[PDB]
Amino acid sequence: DELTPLDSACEVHKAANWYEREIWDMYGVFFANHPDLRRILTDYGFEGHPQRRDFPLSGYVELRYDDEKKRVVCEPLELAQEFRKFDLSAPWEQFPNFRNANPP
């Protein structure tokens, strides 16, 4: 879950070290015994883990540049053209084989 931690493969395969950092950044799945759980991809001071499916595609904030402050500031989101989804849902079940198979 999003709360309980998870075992670390750093002690098993040295290859995984960066991956655990990646999932931690991208989902928030803690890893126990991981040497250093620093974020990898997202920028510094980024709040939330975007790869979750309860996270808006465009994020909550976006950056610009200030002249009063000679610096780049994060601002609430503001989109020139709101991302137009398309509802691509099948009305007709195209696959019977998976219908009742794998039931509880």
Binding site: T42, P50, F55, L63, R64, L79, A80
Partner: protein, 182 residues
């Protein structure tokens, strides 16, 4: 929209002059300041030094232009690594949030007169990643862009065509001639 003149119209017309200002100057000061602007623009136009920022995918075209097929130093363009010695910055690739402050810092550490070419769609308007939580939608939101080279990436011809367009902009800039009015 306008269109090119036709053969006979060209025949009537004279030479289009060289200095884009023209040669209609009234007095000695006007005529003199016209020439000095022309010399300045000629210097800044002939020798222009990109900074080679080149973050991504677009960068490969930014290298092919240096390559020997559409030679760019042929035009007087050289890749100086140090921004203090670079006169132009070809921002190319996506601008992520981690990069935004870096681009800003690099830009203003460069001394002016500084011109920016926004190569590729990723820099122009965020390109294909426009609705992303981590990308600066365009690079107009960090720095003042001067020339836009559409493409994904732009074919090398397109890029250095834009360079020539920047040269034209560098050619017609009015600094001394119009200081005289200031």
């Amino acid at each position: 929209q306008q269109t090119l003149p036709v053969a006979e119209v060209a025949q009537n017309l004279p030479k289009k002059g060289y200095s884009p200002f023209g040669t209609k100057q009234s007095s000695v000061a006007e005529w003199s300041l016209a020439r000095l602007d022309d010399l300045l623009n000629w210097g800044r136009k002939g020798s222009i030094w990109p900074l080679t920022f080149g973050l991504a995918c677009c960068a490969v075209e930014m290298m092919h232009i240096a390559a020997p097929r559409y030679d760019m130093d042929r035009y007087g363009v050289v890749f100086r690594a140090s921004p203090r010695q670079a006169d132009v910055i070809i921002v190319a690739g996506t601008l992520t949030n981690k990069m935004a402050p870096a681009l800003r810092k690099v830009y203003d550490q460069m001394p002016e007169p500084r011109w920016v070419i926004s190569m590729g769609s990723c820099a122009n308007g965020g390109g294909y990643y426009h609705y992303s939580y981590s990308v600066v939608r365009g690079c107009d939101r960090i720095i003042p862009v001067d020339i836009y080279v559409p493409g994904c990436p732009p074919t090398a011809e397109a890029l250095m065509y834009g360079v020539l367009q920047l040269q034209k902009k560098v050619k017609r800039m009015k600094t001394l001639q119009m200081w005289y009015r200031k």
